[PDB]
From Swiss-Prot, chain A:
Belongs to the aspartate/glutamate racemases family. Keywords: Cell shape, Cell wall biogenesis/degradation, Isomerase, Peptidoglycan synthesis. Homodimer. This is Glutamate racemase. One of its GO terms (biological process) is regulation of cell shape. Pathway: Cell wall biogenesis; peptidoglycan biosynthesis. Substrate binds at D19, S20, Y51, G52, N83, T84, T188, H189. It catalyses: L-glutamate = D-glutamate. Its EC number is 5.1.1.3. GO terms for molecular function: glutamate racemase activity. The active site is at C82 (proton donor/acceptor), C187 (proton donor/acceptor). HAMAP family: Glu_racemase.
Amino acid sequence: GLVPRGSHMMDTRPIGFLDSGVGGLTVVCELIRQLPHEKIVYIGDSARAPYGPRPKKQIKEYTWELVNFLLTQNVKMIVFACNTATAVAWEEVKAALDIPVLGVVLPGASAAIKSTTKGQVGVIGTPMTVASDIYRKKIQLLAPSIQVRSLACPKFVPIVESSIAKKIVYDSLAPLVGKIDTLVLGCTHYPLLRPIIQNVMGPSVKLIDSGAECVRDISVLLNYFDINGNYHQKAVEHRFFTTANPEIFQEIASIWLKQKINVEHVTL
Amino acid sequence: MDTRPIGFLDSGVGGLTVVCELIRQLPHEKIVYIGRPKKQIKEYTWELVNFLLTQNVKMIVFACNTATAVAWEEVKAALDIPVLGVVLPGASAAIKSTTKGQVGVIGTPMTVASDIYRKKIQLLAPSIQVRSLACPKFVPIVESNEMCSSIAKKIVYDSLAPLVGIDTLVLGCTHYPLLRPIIQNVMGPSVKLIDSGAECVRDISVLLNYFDINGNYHQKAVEHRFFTTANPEIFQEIASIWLKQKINVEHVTL
């Protein structure tokens, strides 16, 4: 990609995102807001969700299909937005690919480590993510002495897709109130409930948005690897794929991205 | 956990300020620090890199700005460990921090002459305006704060006058951050100052995570090593003051 009226060539490839559903779209929203000039290719494998309870073998197998589909789309980078896919095959995919491979869990974990005051970290997410305990594992793999308390908030995802909402958050986070100094939003759906969560936890707790942290890593890594696009070139050629139920996918997508986005249904 | 030290190379001693930034943001990481035509500066840099590699560093940071301009990309393409300079991160921060796209940059005659800052800024964001000033009068002062502020203001302004009245100023020299308060004053309150060294340390964090080479978080690194090819005496005095702790240096002959 030659810069118009310019002299240098800049990468024109898009950044790829894989997920077993629509939650990852919030990481996509963060990308658009921070790096408006970067193209996106999103593949949501809802047809085989939930990944969570399935055997590692299948998860590795499904993840790779998502990876290869992204590669056929000529992506310069791949972002894991699915917690289970990240826990099971993120490591091997990253070691094998020739392009940068990132996840959302890692930067959220790291930011928690760097932001805690007394060493009391909280993690809220889905029963599955809390069940895998992946955030605590990543956090403690780097700083084993950090105390991590993880709580499932099963009413959160439904609320995302009102005074009742307020009550629900207050009751769901109650067990955490006053017991931590840092809280990881361990579900990509939760960034939409941030203001209420901040209100329930009080000003004494710092909120860590894993998706935003991840998007910050993307910015530094694109530059580090010299695959950044022209900063003045607004991007719009965004591709969205799903392996199932495109109707609701477009519903949720159009809403969060605040623009009618077009979803393409595909078969892997 | 990778207990290896992070390496820092410098043509001078100003890079010591990036080290300080490292200590402040990453108290747990150990440090190994060591601090004319092109081909010559290139070779000299390689010798500095060779030294750091014998010290078993897991990463190399170019503190100096002229060294970065001259050999950073060459060394980075040739090593198996991460390598970064301060220019790109300063460049990237200015672009994100710029309001009207009017960015200025001050540094050493050598640094400005290379025009590395406008080049990297425009390389990422081609339509951003960049004004690069020269300040050969700004030499490393140990405790510039001990000098009467009104004296420093006159001297600072005397070099930064042409630039007065750009919306972002990049500190293109590693020891310039020691003169920040004055620079901030002389440049007025509507000029956001960019500290390249500090932006670099923020990048270091991302890359230590990316390459999975973070050190042990539950301890304060206390085994840093400072080397110089020159006057070890003047060096320790400078370093002890900037790091607010009596550090011990070792003279080496490259």
